[PDB]
């Protein structure tokens, strides 16, 4: 469990980070802009945990561009970027909302403050729900509807979602004791809608999870590279684009999502359209106090 590699995960995390705030002006075509922050990840050492999410107001998460498309930051738009590096499997996951081109906003505020809430709450030997408490009040108290589908969670070397959610509310049964070494994305969202979300297309991502039999000849060899390329880590539509007809690639991904050896990770709407907040630290528990990978 290098934790040396994780921090430096972390610190590549929070470097493109602080870029891609500097480089989320209006009329910054969305494409460039997650290219840009990609290509500086892998100059400072780092490879990318997955496609770097640039979500948008009612749109939560798993949005990440394609090429082709012309999505351009518009001012007054509250944009998620969720940045992810690791370093020999090592991953640090952080995120920020930004009003482009304006002033932090108290919906912006009620996330960044639950997050910091939840760290400060965080040693080893408190229970999850703890950091639930934590993170609701915040939200809440400032009149906002924290998202309850969409948490934080575990994270494990090769493993982005490992399986126990930090989730952004107080659950009597959320019982999960913090350990020593415990690696965890604590992610707030805060939204003016529902305070719930669903899937809508498009699936922009993707995952390897199973190798499985694939008939098809084009699916099997599309389904190798995947796994040479890019393993158990998620993946952008975006990546394979370059090479490949972009129908016969739609057709192979669809394929393999069918068989099972890929999944999906399609976008998430508020489901009331609800304009959408978000603030990610990775953190090492330690026993009286954590670590933050991300700071």
Same mark, same amino acid.
């Given at each position: ?105 108290? &919906? ?20 999850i729900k703890?950091?639930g ?20 969670? !575990?994270?494990?070397?090769? !493993? ?7 989730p952004?509310?107080?659950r009597?049964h959320d019982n999960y ?44 060899? &599309?389904?190798?590279?995947? !796994? ?39 976008? &998430? !709407? ?26």
């Open positions: 469990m290098d934790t040396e590699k994780l921090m430096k995960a972390g610190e590549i995390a929070k470097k493109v980070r602080e870029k891609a705030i500097k480089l989320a002006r209006p009329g910054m075509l969305l494409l460039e802009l997650a290219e840009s922050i990609e290509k500086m990840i892998m100059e400072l050492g780092g490879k990318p945990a997955f496609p770097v999410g640039l979500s948008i107001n009612e749109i939560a998460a798993h949005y990440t561009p394609y090429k082709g498309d012309t999505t351009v930051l518009k001012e007054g738009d509250y944009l998620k970027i969720d940045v992810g590096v690791h370093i020999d499997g090592f991953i640090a996951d952080t995120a920020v909302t930004v009003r482009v081109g304006m002033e932090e906003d108290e &919906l912006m505020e009620a996330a960044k403050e639950a997050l910091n809430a939840a760290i400060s709450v965080a040693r080893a030997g408190v229970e703890e950091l408490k934590a993170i609701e009040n915040e939200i809440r108290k400032r009149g906002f509807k924290p998202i309850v589908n969409l948490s934080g969670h !575990k994270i494990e070397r090769y !493993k982005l979602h490992a399986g126990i959610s930090i952004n509310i107080y009597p004791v913090l350990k020593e070494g415990d690696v965890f994305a604590i992610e707030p969202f805060a939204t003016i809608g529902a305070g719930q979300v669903i899937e809508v297309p498009p699936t922009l991502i993707y995952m390897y999870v199973r190798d499985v039999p694939v008939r098809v000849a084009q699916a099997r060899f &599309l389904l190798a590279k995947i !796994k040479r390329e890019y393993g158990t880590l998620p993946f952008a539509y975006r990546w394979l684009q370059n090479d490949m007809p972009e129908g016969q690639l739609k057709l192979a991904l669809k394929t393999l999502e069918k068989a099972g050896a890929i999944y999906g990770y399609p976008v &998430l !709407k508020e489901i009331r359209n609800g304009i959408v907040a978000q603030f990610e630290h990775t953190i090492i528990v330690e026993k009286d106090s954590v670590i933050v990978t991300t700071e």
